[PDB]
């Protein structure tokens, strides 16, 4: 049973090296159910906010990707009303070499750099392409309303 072992080893590695940009841990005693917090990157409309995410590890992890979703609402082109994320490594580009730490780093980078090419919400991607001040302002609004 590689899943439990690797999840424990990953939690140990996160204890030894804490990433300032995010922090995660098992919600209770279900090692296959974690809760993560991603901090808003500086000089970004999400600055100052703290976004919570739920993570479910499959039983044959790391061979299948974890289910990651946003519980805190966020105004982002690639993130849904219910909170799903259009990230390749969670769907098509999953690899057994990826850790939950690398997944949270990829999510932080997607927050820093949204992907307009294939968006989960077309309206926000259009705003980003056309009106960036409106995009930054609406994301600031949403961060003040929900992330705080």
């Amino acid at each position: 049973g590689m899943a439990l072992k690797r999840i424990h080893k990953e939690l140990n590695d996160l204890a030894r090296d804490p990433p300032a940009q995010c922090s995660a841990g098992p919600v209770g005693d279900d090692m296959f159910h974690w809760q993560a917090t991603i901090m808003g990157p500086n000089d970004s409309p999400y600055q100052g906010g703290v976004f919570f995410l739920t993570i479910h590890f499959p039983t044959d992890y790391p061979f299948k990707p974890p289910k990651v979703a946003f519980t805190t609402r966020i105004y982002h082109p690639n993130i849904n009303s219910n909170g799903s994320i259009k990230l390749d490594i969670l769907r098509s580009q999953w690899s057994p070499a990826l850790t939950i730490s690398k997944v949270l780093l990829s999510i932080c980078s997607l927050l820093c750099d949204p992907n307009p090419d294939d968006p989960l919400v077309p309206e926000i991607a259009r705003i980003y392409k056309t009106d960036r001040e409106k995009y930054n302002r609406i994301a600031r609004e949403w961060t003040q309303k929900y992330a705080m």
């Binding site: 690797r6 590695d13 061979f63 070499a97 850790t99």
Partner: protein, 72 residues
Amino acid sequence: MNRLRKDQLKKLPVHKFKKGDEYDVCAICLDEYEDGDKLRILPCSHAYHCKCVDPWLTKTKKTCPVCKQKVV
């Protein structure tokens, strides 16, 4: 076919691990290689535990877990 068959898997080399070799950690299981482990070697020179990469190479995909390179 995306996956590899077992006869294709057996054509990839298996290296016995000596303490001084070029690999250190199995990118999959994240543990350090121990003296005597069997390692599957890929065409791109990436290596893993047999017990770790063989299930991925056969059950799921035939690409490298690190560099996405197909294994032919």
